[PDB]
Design a protein around this nucleic acid. Sequence first.
DNA 1: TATCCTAACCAAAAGATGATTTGATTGAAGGGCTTAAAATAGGTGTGACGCTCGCTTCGGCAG
DNA 2: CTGCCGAAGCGAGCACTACTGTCACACCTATTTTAAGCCCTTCAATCAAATCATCTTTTGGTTAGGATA
Lengths: 97, 180
Amino acid sequence: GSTTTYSSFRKNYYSKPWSNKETDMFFLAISMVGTDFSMIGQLFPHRARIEIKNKFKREEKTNGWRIDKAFQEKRPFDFDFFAHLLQKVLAEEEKRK
Amino acid sequence: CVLITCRQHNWPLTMGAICTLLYADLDVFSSTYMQIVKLLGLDVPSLCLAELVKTYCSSFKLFQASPSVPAKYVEDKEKMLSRTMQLVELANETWLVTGRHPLPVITAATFLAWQSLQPADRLSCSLARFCKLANVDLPYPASSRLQELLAVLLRMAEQLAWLRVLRLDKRSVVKHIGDL
DNA sequence: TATCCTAACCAAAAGATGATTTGATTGAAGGGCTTAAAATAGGTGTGACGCTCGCTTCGGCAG
DNA sequence: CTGCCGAAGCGAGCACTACTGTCACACCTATTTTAAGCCCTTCAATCAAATCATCTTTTGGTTAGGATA
């Protein structure tokens, strides 16, 4: 302990960077779920709802056109299929890498 | 309350020293401070730049020999404090302090002033390698302020031929500030 | 010969020198958040309160 | 067989532990745009130190360049 207790803003913690296939899956969920960030957070257990909102905010800066294109590329919704796709594609990414 | 009181009597103090005791958090006490001040509408001075250096520089252990700081590390407080005053006067007019946390500026200025008072024994040191010997902790923005000031002095040096002739850079300029 | 001094120079001692890779430094971003504001809806959980005249106790005979 | 009145004894005013419950509102839910800073990994790109390949001066020492004994 010392009197020189430096203080600075730490709320900007290190979060795991978003993966490219994870972003593709986010767009797929936009197409097949919608913008229900809570249910997306359930679909992405790695990502909490606030991360989903942050992803929406960052993507809409330039990729809002892709948000719309995905949202119109509607698909039947299945939680189990989405989970299998997520894990399988991530494992295939690891194997390719 | 004690913060505002000390400010009225311009008694030096900083947030961290107080908040180490109260189990406080930046958001909590900063928001409470804003609420109280805007509720009561009280006037209060700001932290004067030179106000805090006087007590801060006196906190260093560089002024007497110790196993952590042999004589080649020991230095006289007067010379370094004069150098740091001559550096902070440069800092503000160069817009460096406005909108920033000042203590990084003070840390960088003190580190470089101490280095340049005996650079041959001190150019081999480093920010952390320094601060740990005097039992001091340093900001990460201290490096940012160091880069800023190094750019400023390299900009300064080219104006004089008898400094320009040495083709100064980051490595060499530290020992020449005594001339600049 | 057997040997030392000692130009030039082998061989190593030793003294040191130019370029490369690898350990280290670095910019900028990934990413995360704040004050300044507008606000109304629903809630639940905390925590206001140095004597020396006066006065007290109890035995040993009178009647 | 009651009790008067003696003898022994102490005393003091002057000393130039609390709840505790209601209750009300602090506390939240929801956000949206700056604009600077501060924040840790993380990647991408470059800089910096020890070693490797190489040149040179002396000691050992020869041939050869030179000499004594």
